[PDB]
DNA sequence: TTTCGGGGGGGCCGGGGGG
DNA sequence: CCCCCCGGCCCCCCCGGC
């Protein structure tokens, strides 16, 4: 078959600010800005798949209307964004003459701005300062720390928070109603649990489950979406007896095809984020895990090394 | 390249259709259903070496486009340049343009994407998003930690498990039929055991075994042939060595280890692996015995990985096992 | 000035014995039949797979691959059908992507009529990556699809001492061949043949002692035999070479010195052990040889209980591992002797 | 400086303080300047009054544990910057080099926080090694040793045969010094560098200063008023 | 040096043919048969296909005992070709099951001989027969005019939109600094037939193409003074340049309408 | 003039004094040098390894080996940095110390040594047999300081071009030499001279230089202070003669190097005071020692063996000290910044003593 | 400080085209 | 025959975890 079905992430991508779930206060602020205009330079930061690009595009559309094509300059990591681009194309766009209503400005949308080089960011400073009367800049990024301090000083900070399970369930229910998808409460709970606050991941998993099995229930959802291995690693590290930890390692991780490097890196991360355990114990476990990680990187990526790491961790915990 | 009979068995038996991929029934069924109704999403294939990921994606492309699939797909791997410039120009142009031959959608196969740079992966995000109406991406990986979370967020994940024994048996039967070979049940069991779920190992060992037989037509591949060609210890040798270590005194254990190793020139690392596998099933009253065994044997394995004195390493193995098992009394 | 070039046979006649007696064909490889038979069968099967030779030093891996290429192609067609890269050449990721790929994609060189009539001439070329364990992980990863895509005209040979240094995908792609250690049981015939060819006279068991001292390395044994032959020829007495002369040439500690060390350890006094070791290090004995001899003496002694041997085995393993990292021999030896004396 | 001050603060390592400033926060603090954080920690981990000592543990024991961890971290760093470029080990290097040793001696800074002194010492060592190499290859044709052997064995005798004559015979020993210099292809810069190498009770700065200026002027004049041989002929 | 032997009276012809598409593709498989030489290649992006055909009449002498496939790299072939002069005859020579191809430049008047050898490459790109397609529009125009239009409009934008409607051909570009539009109409002159603009329309068409691909395509204007463009809504655009005994064809896929 | 250690260095095999068995073995090797394998001379520092190598070369080729010249070779890295290597060469042999360029020593092996290896011998260097020499000799000093990559590069170079060159590697210890290189070489142990041989050499030097000695015992004492290092013994004799107006008395003291005195003072301080402030002062002393080209391994060895000679320590303290020394010597081998490991060792010793 | 590899930005050099 | 435009090397500088 040479035909494609449009992904539901694109088909049901919000087109207005009112269709975005989560971060209610920021969405209301953006709605007020759209109503009144005078949009300032802004930096929107947050975790993947929470509606940052969607928010920026919706704000630009509501602000500009018919003028969107002329008054919006969009650049992302897939386009050329070197110092020359900033110095020529962005400057030309900023200096461009464009008659707009008495409360609107041209918009430059720099998506994934955290990937831009230091030189381009430095060149953007006086460009933003001088042409603010007619042009405004909207950065979208995952890590606001990558944006240099002078640019942060020039922009309004908007830190997006993770989506609660309630909002994900609400959006999934809207999509299900619009698509007439047969489902069960347990299946939706499994999808939400596996998504971990990633709306895009949740929608993709729902669409894949519907396509592959039809009915959205726990069995089909877990068949399509594998249980995250970090939870398995956490269970392995928290086991009371060495035999149980070895059992988990051999059955749920090693026999499923997970590589030793992945297992050791996930163990390091989980141990780092193990608040239930005393910090000094966590540091000793990290020392052992690092020894094992160095051994694996050298080339000895065997099940015996991971078993020895588990044995040392249990000896420390005892 | 005069004929397909000149190719190594690992490549001469490469599946050409989705019906020739074994041990991945769930993934094959799901992808076949996706393609049948035109609901193919962006795909990720994560799995260990030699499980059938490249074979599966190539078979899927051939099924979608037919024999002339190479000209209608953009395949990139670790042997080709995949920098940020490549993503910006070549991948973008392929994704944004129509097919030359047909009017169908376009497929981009990023094999071994775990070797891609972070900048290229980041550049791929909006490329995947913008052109999803007419283009689809497939990613293949052995190590998931090398893939950025943004890329993983946009793909549907399929895990290729280590090949089950039944699938290996069926493929071995097909290969035996094609090659006009004979294999004993014990030889098949040993081959499956040493495969560790990798089909390439099975095929290479079978080719070596065929090369070993004086008369490949009349002769049959026995476990002895497999052990000789692979130069691996027999289960009886491992059992004898372990029994001597556990029961006999130091002199007798040293003599037995040396004699067993010198009988066929076995490697110490293979003996250590076999003994570890045997001891895994042992029921130990004290967990400290298991702790000592694992730690000391892992240390010895790491030391062997860098060379060193072989006799001292063997004595270390003997002493480590004896000391660890001394903790089962009190 | 200038010197007339020497003939191949004349030049080889005055080479070191290790190079002089390098195998010229697959039939001259001594104790690697389990793999040599498989390689030989490819002369007729003509379906040679990708090969990963791995083994300890001086076991016959490079010799085996060179002999196989010679037998497959012949003296005239070898050069056009072989691309060899080793640790003395740059092998970065860019090199793998460009040069190796370009050679792998080339059409095979046209065989001559004589070559076709005299040699099997398989329809593919060979890329040898000797000392492949020195290549980085990324460069190795760059070879994965090159190996499979162009397997119809190219085959790869990777040779190494440490198989763990090869990434798992490459090891999976290649057919593995382990080269066994060469000892007195499986390598005596070749050494005896070399000694007879060079007319070396030695006492009974001298060759066995040489092979035992070599500890799996036939190159070392041949070099030791050449040294002993040179000594005997210089002496001019005509007497047979003895095991004592071989041991002295090999740097083996005399038994009396080992017994003195054992007695000092038994005494247990730190000052005496330190003084004796300080005097001992002046002789220049290799620490590895001393550790090996001590291990042999202690493990095979019936006057020590199981616990003592259990502890001493781990002590010797730790000392050997530390020495393998290039540590100060004096400090490590003194520490080992003190720790043994405290058992 | 702020990173060193915060990482060595004992409050963040307490039961209550660890839940607010978590281990992830400390790793991020290291990643703020990974290049300089381990150096600052190694520089300032011996200048604190700890408040995290375990019952029965002295300050010296915790210092020794921190030093051991710092050595392990140095090994890890050497691994990172090798031909394999194992940058994925950077987080582990954060724990071994900064977080663990700091947690072992966390407390109140007993004095002013000092910038790392390792870089200046490294530059000085590189300069002195370059000078030693120059001297060694100037005297290679005469001596039989490596540069290390030249520094450890030859230099004291060269001092005895180069500096002592000035202090003992006054200005009448200039000829002997010049003869020795010529025999080993040594120049005036080589003489000064050699005199600059000695440590302990053999320091020559005060001794060189105490020499009468007339003797030094005469030595320079005599050296400049004659031809000398050249060891390495550059072309 | 007997299996395949082809002769070009002037080496400039083969050099110009190679330069016509050397910037589009890198690896090309030339298939030589008794009826002449053909070649088909696809660029790395898989957006442009180049198809070259040269008949026997283009050669002073041509002999090919059996069909032979030769895989070549374009930059190496061009580097070898540029060595020869414009007054020297060229000869392509290949043996049975060759591993290389020989290029011989001859100058009888000066008795000058120049031999070059190029190693062949194994390319698993089977010749894909391009089934003939009916096109909505077929327009033939001078090569210079098309090249000028492409060079002018490519400066403004990276995409060029071609519209064919009743007795009118429009080339449009829209970019950051402005837009450009060129309108041409059919016109025939008997005094200067070489400058005529010929248009045959069945259905109107409107297709967008990448500017870089058009810039590469126009490099074949040297081979022929006129260019024929065939456009259909359901087929890729076909740009053809006619040689004395052959042709060079560029099949360019249009951009997705979205 | 030239120091007595250099002035009286033997220049031939027949001129060697100590280790007659080694001299006979070297003569046997030089009897038929056409098929001489690669040589690896290992032994304690300052025993005469370089002297014996030069004597062997003289026996093989002739006195011309001692006519040495120095040239400079330029190398470029992947980063475009320019490095200079000082090459000591003679008409028959070439000497190199690749470790001079640190991690770039591999370059020397890949370009310089390979270039020399691919060049055949064409100059008519008539030998004792009657024909001309066919190979050149390459000496690698401080071969044990080479990086593993450089040794790997040497691996196949020594085999492919053995017909063109022969390698002689001199080392104070074989522990850092990788197994393949050792397999590729003929190992030669060079024992240190005995006390009597050192005394005889010193007496010959004294007679040649006309030095007044109250009794021969003084020389014996010098030998005892040398610990088998002949170069150190000769230099100490010259220093003592200069200090005592070319007249040695039974009461003349033994002169130690400045760094030895500093290390002994550091050992005394460590034994006396065990505190964090004392550790800071020890760090300052270590920095001073390192800044003046005192290798870290030498510092560690000297400090360990000075601590082990303290009469106030018991057996447990000495055992702990030697164990810590072994551990931190391994750490130094695998480490980059030596000061970290030295400070860790000192802290562990201080904890063990207290 | 810095042992590969990737990315970016700036400087010349030189082929080709135009007048 | 000479001048100008513009593609391609060449070099040098800077991250490298989440
Ligand atoms: N708050 C949201 N409400 C509704 N849909 C959402 C929301 N967030 C994400 N989605 C859905 O997921 C798709 C992708 O959302 P995006 O705005 O691209 O997330 P993102 O944070 O910009 O992703 P990154 O940071 O570039 S990885 C949208 O088209 C929506 O279909
Ligand atoms: N499921 C399978 N069924 C049949 N043959 C298989 C299967 N998997 C692997 N093989 C065989 O092993 C060879 C390699 O299979 P691949 O598809 O390349 O495995 P892979 O997972 O892509 O390896 P990596 O991840 O690149 S190391 C095939 O040509 C087959 O001959
Ligand atoms: N199996 C063997 N049969 C005969 N001679 C051997 C054999 N192995 C080693 N030798 C001898 O030792 C010399 C070196 O053999 P090699 O083939 O170079 O061993 P190697 O395994 O390749 O060494 P490495 O791994 O590079 S240290 C040969 O020239 C032979 O003279
Ligand atoms: N008289 C005499 N002096 C020797 C002999 N061997 C070495 N020496 C002296 O000892 C010095 C040091 O020898 P050297 O080879 O440089 O030491 P090594 O290379 O570190 O082993 C030399 O300068 C000689 O003067 C010998 O056999 N006889
Ligand atoms: Mg986004
Ligand atoms: Mg694959
Ligand atoms: Mg080899």
With CA atoms as reference, report the closest residue to A44 among A163, A139, A111: A139
Q: Residue E165: helix, strand or coil by DSSP?
A: strand
Mutation choice for E interface testing from B61, B71, B98, B103 by most E CBs within 10 A: B98
Element (H, E) at E40: strand E36-42
Instruction: Give the residues after which the backbone of chain E is interrupted, taking a C-to-next-N distance over 2.5 angstroms as a break.
Output: none
Residue B91 DSSP one-character state = I
**What's the rounded Cα separation, in Å, for the pair C304 and B251?**
10
Chain D residues whose C-beta sits inside 8 Å of any chain A C-beta: 13, 18-19, 22-24, 27, 72, 76, 79, 84, 86, 88-89, 91-92, 95-96, 99-100, 103
With CA atoms as reference, report the closest residue to B292 among C185, C314, E43: C314
With CA atoms as reference, report the closest residue to F98 among F40, F152, F142, F49: F142
Domain range list for chain A: 1-163, 164-227, 228-318
Burial A62-74 (b: 16+ CB within 10 A, else e): bbbeeeeeebbbb
For domain F258-353, the CATH architecture is Up-down Bundle (1.20)
Tell me if C161 is assigned to a ligand binding site.
Answer: yes
User: Which 85-114 residues of chain D touch chain F by CB within 8 A?
Assistant: none
Q: How far is CA F68 from the centre of its chain?
A: 20
F343 CA → G7 C1’, Å: 40
**What's the rounded Cα separation, in Å, for the pair E135 and E230?**
6
Burial F211-225 (b: 16+ CB within 10 A, else e): bebeeeebbeebbee
**What's the rounded Cα separation, in Å, for the pair D201 and D217?**
26
**What's the rounded Cα separation, in Å, for the pair F82 and F88?**
20
Segment E76-80 long-range contacts (CB within 8 Å, at least 24 positions apart) = E76/E118, E77/E18, E77/E22, E77/E118, E78/E15, E78/E18, E78/E19, E78/E22, E80/E116, E80/E118
- Chain E residues whose beta carbon lies within 8 Å of the beta carbon of residue B109: none
| Cα-to-centroid distance, A139 and ligand 1 (Å) | 15
With CA atoms as reference, report the closest residue to B267 among B248, B293, B241: B241
Give Cα separations from C24 to C29, C56, C199, F160 (angstroms).
9, 21, 21, 15
**Same-domain status, C84 and C117:** yes
Of C14, C323, C328, the CB nearest to F301: C328
Where do you find CATH 1.20.272.10 in chain F? 258-353
Topology given in CATH for the domain delimited by F195-248: Helicase, Ruva Protein; domain 3 (1.10.8)
* Longest CA span, chain A: 74
Burial A159-186 (b: 16+ CB within 10 A, else e): ebeebeeebbbebbeebbeeeebebeee
Tell me if B11 is assigned to a ligand binding site.
Answer: yes
**What's the rounded Cα separation, in Å, for the pair B278 and F138?**
53
Residue E174 DSSP one-character state = E
E-assigned strand segments in chain D? 48-50, 107-109
Contact A268/D at CB under 8 A: yes
Contact D71 F339 (CB under 8 A): no
CB distance C211 to C191 below 8 Å? yes
| Cα-to-centroid distance, B204 and ligand 3 (Å) | 25
Contact E177 A92 (CB under 8 A): yes
Structure determination technique employed: cryo-EM
Name the β-bridge partners of E141.
E227
Domains: count for chain E: 1
Could you tell me the residue range of the domain that residue E203 belongs to? 1-258
- Chain C residues whose beta carbon lies within 8 Å of the beta carbon of residue D83: 136
- Ligand closest to Cα of A259 equals 2
**What's the rounded Cα separation, in Å, for the pair E38 and E129?**
11
Cβ neighbours of residue B258 under 8 Å, at least 6 residues apart?
Answer: B314
Residue A144 DSSP one-character state = G
CB distance D160 to D114 below 8 Å? no
The secondary structure of A35-79, three-state, reads HHCCCCCEEEECCCCCCHHHHHHHHHHHHHHHHHHHHEEEECCCC
The secondary structure of A69-137, three-state, reads HHHEEEECCCCCCCHHHHHHHHHHHHHCCCCCCCCCCEEEEEECHHHCCHHHHHHHHHHHHHCCCCEEE
Q: What is the dihedral of CA C86, C90, C92, C98, to 10 degrees?
A: -90
| Degrees to nearest 5, angle at CA D57 with A271 and D92 | 25
- Ligand closest to Cα of C179 equals 3
- Chain F residues whose beta carbon lies within 8 Å of the beta carbon of residue D61: 351
Instruction: Give the protein-side footprint of strand H (Cβ within 7 Å).
Output: A 118, 143, 265, 269; B 118, 145; D 28, 31, 34, 85, 87-88, 90-91; F 79-80
| Chain B / chain E CB contacts < 8 angstroms | 48
Name the β-bridge partners of C37.
none
**What's the rounded Cα separation, in Å, for the pair F155 and F160?**
9
Contact D35/C at CB under 8 A: no
**Same-domain status, C147 and C38:** yes
Domains: count for chain C: 3
A82 CA → G12 C1’, Å: 21
CA atoms within 13 A on the CB side of A170: 9
**What's the rounded Cα separation, in Å, for the pair B185 and B171?**
15
Number of H helices, E strands in chain E: 4, 18
Give Cα separations from F96 to D146, F12, F87 (angstroms).
11, 22, 6
CB distance F293 to D148 below 8 Å? yes
**What's the rounded Cα separation, in Å, for the pair B243 and B239?**
6
| Degrees to nearest 5, angle at CA E189 with E187 and E190 | 150
Could you tell me the residue range of the domain that residue C214 belongs to? 183-252
**Same-domain status, C219 and C332:** no
* Longest CA span, chain D: 78
CB distance A103 to A38 below 8 Å? yes
With CA atoms as reference, report the closest residue to B266 among B290, B238, B308: B238
With CA atoms as reference, report the closest residue to C125 among C50, C37, C176: C50
Residue nearest to atom 25 of ligand 4 (CA): F9
Name the residue with tokens 């967990």.
Answer: B287
Give Cα separations from B173 to B169, B183, F220 (angstroms).
6, 9, 84
With CA atoms as reference, report the closest residue to D42 among D10, D80, D6, D68: D68
CB distance E34 to E96 below 8 Å? no
By CB atoms closer than 10 A (0-12, 13-18, 19+), residue C92 is middle
Segment A14-20 long-range contacts (CB within 8 Å, at least 24 positions apart) = A14/A51, A14/A54, A14/A58, A15/A58, A15/A61, A16/A58, A16/A61, A16/A62, A17/A55, A17/A58, A17/A59, A17/A62, A19/A58, A20/A51, A20/A54, A20/A55, A20/A58
| Degrees to nearest 5, angle at CA D52 with D49 and D58 | 65
Name the β-bridge partners of E255.
B97
**What's the rounded Cα separation, in Å, for the pair F149 and F99?**
12
Residue nearest to atom 29 of ligand 2 (CA): B14
Decide if domain F4-189 falls under CATH 1.10.260.40. no
| Cα-to-centroid distance, A9 and ligand 1 (Å) | 8
CB distance B262 to B301 below 8 Å? no
Number of Cβ within 10 Å of residue C224's Cβ equals: 23
Structure tokens belonging to residue F157: 């170079």
By CB atoms closer than 10 A (0-12, 13-18, 19+), residue A240 is exposed
- Chain A residues whose beta carbon lies within 8 Å of the beta carbon of residue D84: 297
Subunits next to E (3 or more Cβ pairs <8 Å) are: A, B, C
Of B112, B318, B326, the CB nearest to C141: B112
The secondary structure of F114-171, three-state, reads HHHHCCCCCCCCECCCCCECCCEEEEECCHHHCCHHHHHHHHHHHHHCCCCEEEEEEE
C95 CA → G13 C1’, Å: 27
The secondary structure of chain F, three-state, reads CCCHHHHCCCCCHHHCCCCHHHHHHHHHHHHCHHHCCCEEEECCCCCCHHHHHHHHHHHHCCHHHHCCEEEEEEEECCCCCEEEEEEEECCCEEEECHHHHHHHHHHHHHHHHHHHHCCCCCCCCECCCCCECCCEEEEECCHHHCCHHHHHHHHHHHHHCCCCEEEEEEECCCCCCCHHHHHCCEEEECCCCCHHHHHHHHHHHHHHHCCEECCCHHHHHHHHHHCCCHHHHHHHHHHHHHHCCCEECCCCCCCCCHHHHHHHHHHHHHHHCCCHHHHHHHHHHHHHHHHCCCCHHHHHHHHHHHHCCCCCCCHHHHHHHHHHHHHHHHHHHHCCCHHHHHHHHHHHHHHHHC
Residue nearest to atom 24 of ligand 2 (CA): B49
- Ligand closest to Cα of B141 equals 2
| Cα-to-centroid distance, C45 and ligand 5 (Å) | 56
Residues with CB under 6 A from ligand 2: B 10-11, 13-15, 21-24, 47, 49-55, 142, 171, 199-200, 203; C 144, 169, 172
Residue A170 DSSP one-character state = H
């Amino acid at each position: 078959t040479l035909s494609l079905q449009l992904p539901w992430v694109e088909k049901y991508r919000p087109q207005v600010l009112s269709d975005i779930v989560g971060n209610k206060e920021t969405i209301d602020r953006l709605q007020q800005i759209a109503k009144d205009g005078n949009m300032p330079h802004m930096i929107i930061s947050g975790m993947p798949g929470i509606g940052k690009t969607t928010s920026v595009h919706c704000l630009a559309h509501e602000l500009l209307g018919r003028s969107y094509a002329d008054g919006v300059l969009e650049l992302n990591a897939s386009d050329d964004r070197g110092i020359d681009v900033v110095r020529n194309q962005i400057k030309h766009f900023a200096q461009k003459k464009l008659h707009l209503p008495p409360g609107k400005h041209k918009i430059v949308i720099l998506d994934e701005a955290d990937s831009m080089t230091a030189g381009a960011q430095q060149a953007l400073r006086r460009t933003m300062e001088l042409y603010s009367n007619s042009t405004r800049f909207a950065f979208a990024c995952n890590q606001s720390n990558k944006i240099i301090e002078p640019l942060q000083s020039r922009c309004a900070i908007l830190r997006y928070s993770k989506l609660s399970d309630e909002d994900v369930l609400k959006r999934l229910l809207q999509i299900i109603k619009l698509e007439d998808v047969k489902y069960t409460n347990d299946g939706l709970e499994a999808i939400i649990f596996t998504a971990e606050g990633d709306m895009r991941q949740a929608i993709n998993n729902l669409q894949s489950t519907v396509a592959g099995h039809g009915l959205v229930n726990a069995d089909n959802v877990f068949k399509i979406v594998d249980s995250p291995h970090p939870l398995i690693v956490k269970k392995m590290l928290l086991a009371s007896n060495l035999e149980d930890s070895i059992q988990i390692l051999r059955t749920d991780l090693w026999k499923k095809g997970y590589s030793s490097i992945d297992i050791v890196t996930t163990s390091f991360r989980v141990t780092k984020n193990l608040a239930q355990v005393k910090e000094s114990v966590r540091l000793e476990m990290i020392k052992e895990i690092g020894l094992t990680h160095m051994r694996i990187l050298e080339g000895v990526g065997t099940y015996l090394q991971l078993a020895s790491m588990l044995a040392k961790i249990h000896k420390l915990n005892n | 390249k005069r004929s397909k009979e000149n190719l190594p068995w690992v490549e001469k038996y490469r599946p050409e259709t989705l019906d020739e991929v074994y041990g991945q029934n769930e993934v094959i069924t799901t992808v076949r259903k996706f393609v049948d109704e035109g609901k193919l999403p962006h795909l990720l294939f994560y799995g260990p070496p030699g499980t059938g990921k490249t074979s599966t994606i190539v078979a899927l492309a051939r099924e979608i486009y037919g024999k002339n699939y190479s000209n209608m797909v953009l395949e990139l791997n670790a042997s080709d340049d995949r920098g940020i410039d490549v993503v910006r120009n070549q991948i973008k142009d392929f994704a944004s343009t129509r097919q030359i031959f047909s009017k169908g959608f376009k497929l981009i196969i990023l094999d071994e994407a775990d070797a891609m740079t972070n900048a290229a992966q980041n550049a791929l995000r909006r490329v995947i998003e913008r052109y999803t109406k007419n283009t689809r991406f497939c990613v293949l990986a052995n190590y998931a930690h090398k893939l950025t979370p943004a890329l993983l967020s946009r793909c549907t994940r399929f895990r290729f498990q280590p090949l089950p024994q039944e699938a290996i048996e069926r493929r071995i039967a097909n290969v035996l039929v094609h090659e006009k070979l004979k294999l004993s049940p014990n030889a098949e069991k040993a081959l499956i055991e040493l495969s560790n779920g990798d089909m390439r190992r099975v095929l290479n060992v079978l080719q070596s075994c065929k090369a070993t037989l004086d008369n490949p037509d009349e002769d049959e591949i026995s476990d002895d042939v497999i052990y000789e060609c692979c130069g691996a210890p027999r289960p009886s040798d491992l059992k004898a060595v372990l029994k001597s270590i556990l029961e006999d005194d130091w002199g007798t254990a040293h003599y037995t280890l040396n004699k067993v190793r010198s009988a066929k020139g076995l490697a110490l690392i293979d003996l250590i692996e076999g003994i570890v596998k045997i001891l895994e099933d042992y029921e130990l009253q004290n967990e400290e015995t298991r702790v000592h065994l694992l730690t000391k044997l892992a240390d010895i394995e790491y030391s062997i990985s860098k060379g060193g004195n072989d006799q001292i390493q063997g004595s270390a193995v003997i002493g480590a096992i004896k000391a660890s098992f001394e903790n089962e009394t009190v | 000035r200038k010197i007339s070039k020497l003939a191949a046979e004349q030049s080889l006649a005055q080479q070191p014995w290790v190079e002089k007696y390098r195998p010229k064909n697959l039939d001259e490889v001594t104790a690697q039949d389990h793999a040599v038979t498989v390689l030989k069968k490819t002369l007729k099967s003509a379906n040679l797979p990708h090969m990963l030779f791995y083994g300890p030093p001086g076991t016959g891996k490079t010799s085996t691959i060179l002999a196989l290429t010679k037998e497959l192609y012949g003296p005239d067609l070898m050069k056009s059908r072989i691309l060899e890269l080793n640790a003395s050449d740059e092998r970065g990721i860019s090199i793998v992507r460009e040069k190796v790929k370009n050679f792998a994609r080339l059409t095979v060189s046209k065989p001559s009529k004589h070559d076709l009539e005299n040699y099997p001439c398989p329809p593919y070329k060979i890329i040898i990556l000797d000392e492949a364990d020195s290549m980085t992980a990324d460069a190795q990863s760059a070879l994965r699809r090159t190996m499979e895509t162009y397997s119809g005209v190219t085959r790869f040979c990777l040779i190494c001492n440490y198989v763990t240094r090869i990434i798992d995908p490459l090891a999976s792609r290649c057919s593995k061949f382990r080269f066994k250690a060469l000892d007195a049981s499986n390598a005596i015939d070749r050494l005896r043949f070399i000694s007879e060819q060079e007319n070396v006279k030695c006492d009974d068991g001298v060759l066995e002692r040489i092979l035992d001292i070599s500890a799996g390395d036939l190159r070392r044994g041949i070099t030791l035999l050449q040294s002993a032959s040179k000594g005997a020829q210089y002496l001019g007495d005509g007497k047979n070479i003895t095991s004592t002369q071989v041991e002295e040439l090999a740097g083996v500690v005399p038994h009396d010195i080992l017994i003195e060390i054992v007695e000092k350890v038994k005494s247990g006094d730190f000052d005496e052990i330190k003084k004796y070791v300080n005097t001992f290090m002046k002789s220049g004995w290799s620490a590895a040889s001393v550790v090996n001899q001590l291990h042999e003496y202690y493990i095979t002694n019936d006057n020590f209980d199981t616990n003592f041997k259990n502890q001493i085995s781990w002590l010797l393993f730790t000392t050997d591992s530390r020495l393998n990292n290039g540590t100060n021999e004096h400090i490590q030896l003194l520490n080992l002797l003190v720790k043994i004396s405290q058992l | 400086f702020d990173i060193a001050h915060k990482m060595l603060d004992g409050q963040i390592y307490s039961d209550i303080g660890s839940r607010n400033f978590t281990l992830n926060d400390k790793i991020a603090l290291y990643f703020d300047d990974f290049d300089f954080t381990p150096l600052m920690i190694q520089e300032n981990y011996l200048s604190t009054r700890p408040s995290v000592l375990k019952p029965g543990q002295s300050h010296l024991e915790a210092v020794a544990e921190a030093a051991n961890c710092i050595s392990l971290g140095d090994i890890v760093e050497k691994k990172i910057r090798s031909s394999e470029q194992l940058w994925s080990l950077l987080p582990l290097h954060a724990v071994l080099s900064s977080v663990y040793p700091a947690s072992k001696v966390a407390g109140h800074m007993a004095g002013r926080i000092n910038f790392t002194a390792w870089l200046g010492q490294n530059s000085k060592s590189a300069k002195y090694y370059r000078l030693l190499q120059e001297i060694h290859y100037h005297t290679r044709l005469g001596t039989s040793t490596d540069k290390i052997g030249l520094r450890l064995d030859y230099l004291p005798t060269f001092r005895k045969r180069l500096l002592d004559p000035f202090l003992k015979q006054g200005a009448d020993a200039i000829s002997s010094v010049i003869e020795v210099m010529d025999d080993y292809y040594l120049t005036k810069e080589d003489w000064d560098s050699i005199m600059e190498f000695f440590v302990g009770p053999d320091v020559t700065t005060a001794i060189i200063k105490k020499i009468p200026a007339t003797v030094k002027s005469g030595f320079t004049r005599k050296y400049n008023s004659m031809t000398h041989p050249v060891a390495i002929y550059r072309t | 040096a007997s299996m395949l032997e082809a002769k070009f009276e002037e080496a400039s012809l083969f050099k110009r043919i190679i330069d016509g598409f050397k910037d589009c593709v890198q690896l090309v498989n030339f298939q030589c048969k008794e009826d002449g030489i053909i070649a088909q290649a696809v660029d790395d992006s898989r957006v442009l296909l180049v198809s070259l055909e040269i008949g026997v009449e283009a050669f002073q002498e041509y002999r090919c005992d059996h069909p032979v496939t030769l895989g070549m790299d374009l930059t190496s072939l061009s580097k070898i070709l540029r060595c020869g002069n414009n007054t020297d005859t060229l000869t392509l020579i290949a043996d049975n099951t060759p591993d290389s191809i020989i290029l011989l430049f001859e100058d009888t008047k000066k008795d000058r001989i120049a031999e070059y050898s190029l190693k062949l490459m194994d390319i698993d790109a089977d010749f894909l027969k391009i089934e003939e397609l009916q096109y909505d529009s077929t327009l033939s125009l001078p090569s210079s005019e098309f090249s000028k239009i492409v060079r002018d409009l490519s400066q403004l934008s990276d995409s060029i939109n071609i519209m064919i409607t009743k007795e009118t051909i429009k080339f449009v570009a829209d970019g950051d600094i402005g837009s450009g539009s060129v309108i041409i109409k059919p016109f025939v002159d008997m005094e200067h037939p070489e400058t005529s603009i010929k248009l045959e329309m069945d259905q109107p068409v409107d297709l967008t193409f990448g500017a870089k691909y058009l810039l590469d395509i126009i490099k074949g204007s040297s081979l022929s003074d006129r260019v024929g463009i065939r456009l259909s809504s359901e087929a890729p655009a076909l740009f053809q340049f006619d040689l004395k005994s052959g042709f060079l064809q560029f099949f360019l896929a249009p951009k997705f309408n979205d | 003039m030239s120091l007595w250690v250099d002035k009286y260095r033997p220049k031939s095999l027949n001129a060697l004094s100590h280790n007659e068995e080694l001299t006979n073995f070297l003569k046997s090797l030089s009897d038929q040098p056409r098929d001489l394998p690669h040589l690896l001379l290992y032994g304690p520092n300052g025993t005469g390894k370089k002297t014996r190598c030069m004597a062997l070369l003289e026996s093989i080729f002739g006195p011309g080996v001692y006519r040495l010249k120095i040239d400079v070779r330029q190398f470029v890295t992947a980063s475009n940095r320019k490095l200079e290597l000082n090459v000591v060469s003679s008409p028959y042999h070439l000497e190199i110390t690749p470790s001079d360029m640190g991690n770039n020593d591999r370059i020397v092996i890949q370009e310089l040594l390979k270039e020399v290896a691919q060049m055949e011998q064409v100059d008519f260097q008539d030998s004792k047999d009657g024909l001309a020499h066919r190979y050149k000799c390459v000496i690698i000093n401080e071969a044990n300081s080479l990086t593993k990559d450089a040794q790997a590069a040497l691996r196949r170079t020594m085999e492919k071009y053995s017909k063109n060159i022969r390698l002689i590697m001199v080392c104070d210890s074989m522990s850092p030499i990788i197994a393949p290189i050792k397999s590729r070489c003929l190992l030669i142990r060079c024992p240190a001279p005995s006390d009597s041989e050192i005394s005889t050499i010193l007496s010959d030097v004294v007679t040649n230089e006309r030095i007044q000695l109250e009794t021969k015992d003084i020389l014996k004492r010098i030998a005892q202070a040398s610990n088998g290092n002949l170069r150190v013994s000769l230099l100490m004799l010259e220093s003592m003669a200069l200090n005592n107006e070319l007249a040695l008395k039974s009461s003349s003291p033994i002169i130690k190097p400045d760094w030895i005195i500093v290390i002994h003072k550091l050992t005394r301080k460590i034994v006396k005071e065990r505190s964090v402030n004392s550790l800071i002062e020890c760090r300052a002393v270590l920095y001073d020692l390192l800044a003046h080209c005192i290798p870290a391994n030498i510092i560690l060895k000297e400090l360990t063996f000075s601590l082990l000679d303290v009469e106030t320590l018991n057996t447990t303290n000495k055992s702990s000290i030697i164990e810590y020394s072994s551990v931190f010597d391994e750490r130094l081998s695998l480490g980059n910044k030596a000061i970290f490991h030295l400070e860790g060792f000192i802290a562990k010793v201080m904890c063990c003593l207290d």
